[PDB]
Amino acid sequence: PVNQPILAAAQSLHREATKWSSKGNDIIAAAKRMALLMAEMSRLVRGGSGTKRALIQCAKDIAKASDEVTRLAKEVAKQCTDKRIRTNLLQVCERIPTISTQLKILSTVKATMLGRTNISDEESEQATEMLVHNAQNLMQSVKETVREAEAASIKITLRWVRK
Protein backbone atom coordinates (compact mmCIF):
# COMPACT_ATOMS: atom_id res chain seq x y z
CA PRO A 1 0.00 0.00 0.00
CA VAL A 2 2.49 2.68 1.17
CA ASN A 3 5.85 4.37 1.11
CA GLN A 4 6.60 3.77 4.82
CA PRO A 5 8.88 6.73 5.50
CA ILE A 6 6.33 9.24 4.12
CA LEU A 7 3.52 7.64 6.11
CA ALA A 8 5.74 7.71 9.25
CA ALA A 9 6.49 11.43 8.69
CA ALA A 10 2.71 12.01 8.32
CA GLN A 11 1.90 10.11 11.55
CA SER A 12 4.66 11.99 13.35
CA LEU A 13 2.93 15.35 12.59
CA HIS A 14 -0.51 13.85 13.33
CA ARG A 15 0.71 12.93 16.84
CA GLU A 16 1.75 16.51 17.64
CA ALA A 17 -1.29 18.15 16.04
CA THR A 18 -3.75 15.83 17.85
CA LYS A 19 -2.45 17.05 21.22
CA TRP A 20 -4.89 19.94 20.70
CA SER A 21 -8.39 20.75 19.51
CA SER A 22 -9.02 22.38 16.11
CA LYS A 23 -11.87 24.40 17.59
CA GLY A 24 -10.84 28.01 17.30
CA ASN A 25 -7.35 26.94 16.14
CA ASP A 26 -6.65 26.99 12.41
CA ILE A 27 -2.98 26.10 12.89
CA ILE A 28 -4.08 22.85 14.46
CA ALA A 29 -6.81 22.26 11.79
CA ALA A 30 -4.41 22.96 8.88
CA ALA A 31 -1.67 20.77 10.43
CA LYS A 32 -4.17 17.87 10.80
CA ARG A 33 -5.26 18.28 7.16
CA MET A 34 -1.55 18.30 6.17
CA ALA A 35 -0.83 15.03 8.02
CA LEU A 36 -3.93 13.33 6.47
CA LEU A 37 -2.97 14.51 2.99
CA MET A 38 0.66 13.46 3.45
CA ALA A 39 -0.59 9.91 4.33
CA GLU A 40 -2.46 9.94 1.01
CA MET A 41 0.78 11.03 -0.65
CA SER A 42 2.61 7.91 0.62
CA ARG A 43 -0.15 5.73 -0.96
CA LEU A 44 0.11 7.59 -4.26
CA VAL A 45 3.91 7.45 -4.64
CA ARG A 46 3.57 3.68 -3.92
CA GLY A 47 0.63 3.09 -6.29
CA GLY A 48 0.35 4.02 -9.96
CA SER A 49 0.41 4.66 -12.76
CA GLY A 50 -2.97 6.41 -12.89
CA THR A 51 -1.74 8.18 -9.76
CA LYS A 52 -0.04 10.97 -11.84
CA ARG A 53 -2.67 13.71 -11.62
CA ALA A 54 -3.44 12.72 -8.01
CA LEU A 55 0.22 12.99 -6.96
CA ILE A 56 0.42 16.58 -8.27
CA GLN A 57 -2.90 17.68 -6.75
CA CYS A 58 -2.16 16.10 -3.36
CA ALA A 59 1.11 18.08 -3.14
CA LYS A 60 -0.83 21.24 -4.11
CA ASP A 61 -3.35 20.57 -1.30
CA ILE A 62 -0.53 20.03 1.21
CA ALA A 63 1.20 23.30 0.10
CA LYS A 64 -2.08 25.26 0.42
CA ALA A 65 -2.60 23.92 3.98
CA SER A 66 1.00 24.87 4.84
CA ASP A 67 0.46 28.50 3.72
CA GLU A 68 -2.30 28.69 6.29
CA VAL A 69 0.07 27.29 9.01
CA THR A 70 2.83 29.76 7.99
CA ARG A 71 0.53 32.79 7.82
CA LEU A 72 -0.98 32.21 11.27
CA ALA A 73 2.25 31.22 13.02
CA LYS A 74 3.85 34.47 11.78
CA GLU A 75 1.02 36.40 13.45
CA VAL A 76 1.58 34.46 16.70
CA ALA A 77 5.33 35.19 16.59
CA LYS A 78 4.67 38.95 16.08
CA GLN A 79 2.66 39.11 19.29
CA CYS A 80 5.20 37.17 21.32
CA THR A 81 7.22 38.97 23.98
CA ASP A 82 10.04 36.42 24.30
CA LYS A 83 12.62 37.25 21.57
CA ARG A 84 14.17 33.78 21.86
CA ILE A 85 10.83 32.10 20.98
CA ARG A 86 9.75 34.87 18.57
CA THR A 87 12.97 34.57 16.52
CA ASN A 88 12.90 30.77 16.51
CA LEU A 89 9.28 30.71 15.41
CA LEU A 90 9.92 33.20 12.63
CA GLN A 91 12.97 31.17 11.54
CA VAL A 92 11.07 27.86 11.22
CA CYS A 93 7.78 29.06 9.82
CA GLU A 94 9.64 30.98 7.09
CA ARG A 95 11.32 27.71 5.90
CA ILE A 96 7.87 26.26 5.19
CA PRO A 97 6.79 28.04 1.94
CA THR A 98 10.13 27.03 0.36
CA ILE A 99 9.80 23.39 1.50
CA SER A 100 6.20 23.15 0.27
CA THR A 101 7.09 24.84 -3.03
CA GLN A 102 9.77 22.13 -3.26
CA LEU A 103 7.11 19.49 -2.52
CA LYS A 104 5.16 20.65 -5.59
CA ILE A 105 8.26 20.56 -7.80
CA LEU A 106 9.41 17.11 -6.68
CA SER A 107 5.89 15.60 -6.84
CA THR A 108 5.48 16.83 -10.39
CA VAL A 109 8.93 15.46 -11.26
CA LYS A 110 7.99 12.04 -9.76
CA ALA A 111 4.58 12.11 -11.52
CA THR A 112 5.72 13.34 -14.95
CA MET A 113 9.50 12.74 -15.07
CA LEU A 114 10.69 13.44 -18.66
CA GLY A 115 7.27 13.31 -20.38
CA ARG A 116 7.18 10.68 -23.13
CA THR A 117 10.87 9.71 -22.76
CA ASN A 118 11.65 6.29 -21.17
CA ILE A 119 12.97 6.32 -17.57
CA SER A 120 15.10 3.76 -15.68
CA ASP A 121 14.38 2.12 -12.33
CA GLU A 122 17.32 4.23 -11.03
CA GLU A 123 15.86 7.61 -12.04
CA SER A 124 12.54 6.36 -10.64
CA GLU A 125 14.04 5.33 -7.27
CA GLN A 126 16.13 8.56 -7.13
CA ALA A 127 12.97 10.64 -7.76
CA THR A 128 11.17 8.74 -5.00
CA GLU A 129 13.97 9.37 -2.50
CA MET A 130 14.06 13.11 -3.31
CA LEU A 131 10.29 13.29 -2.66
CA VAL A 132 10.67 11.24 0.56
CA HIS A 133 13.34 13.54 2.05
CA ASN A 134 11.34 16.65 1.24
CA ALA A 135 8.17 15.15 2.86
CA GLN A 136 10.11 14.36 6.06
CA ASN A 137 11.59 17.89 6.13
CA LEU A 138 8.10 19.37 5.70
CA MET A 139 6.47 17.22 8.38
CA GLN A 140 9.35 18.03 10.77
CA SER A 141 9.07 21.78 10.13
CA VAL A 142 5.30 21.97 10.71
CA LYS A 143 5.55 19.82 13.88
CA GLU A 144 8.24 22.17 15.22
CA THR A 145 6.01 25.12 14.15
CA VAL A 146 3.01 23.67 16.08
CA ARG A 147 5.10 23.13 19.27
CA GLU A 148 6.66 26.63 19.14
CA ALA A 149 3.41 28.37 18.20
CA GLU A 150 1.87 26.91 21.37
CA ALA A 151 4.96 27.80 23.44
CA ALA A 152 4.75 31.36 22.05
CA SER A 153 1.01 31.68 22.89
CA ILE A 154 1.79 31.34 26.60
CA LYS A 155 3.45 34.81 26.19
CA ILE A 156 0.24 36.34 24.77
CA THR A 157 -7.68 35.16 19.60
CA LEU A 158 -6.18 31.66 19.15
CA ARG A 159 -7.26 28.68 21.28
CA TRP A 160 -5.12 25.92 22.80
CA VAL A 161 -7.14 23.19 24.47
CA ARG A 162 -5.53 19.86 25.25
CA LYS A 163 -7.45 16.81 24.08
Packing angle between helix 121-153 and helix 26-45, nearest 10 degrees?
Answer: 170
For the chain, the three-class secondary structure string (H helix, E strand, C coil) is CCCHHHHHHHHHHHHHHCCECCCCCHHHHHHHHHHHHHHHHHHHHCCCCCCHHHHHHHHHHHHHHHHHHHHHHHHHHCCCCCHHHHHHHHHHHCCHHHHHHHHHHHHHHHHHCCCCCCCCHHHHHHHHHHHHHHHHHHHHHHHHHHHHHHHHHCCCCCCCCEC
- Beta-bridged to residue 162, according to DSSP, are 20
Contact of 158 with 22, CB cutoff 8 Å: no
Q: Going by C-beta distance under 8 Å and a sequence separation of 6 or more, which residues neighbour residue 95?
A: 141
Q: What is the CATH number of domain 1-163?
A: 1.20.120.230
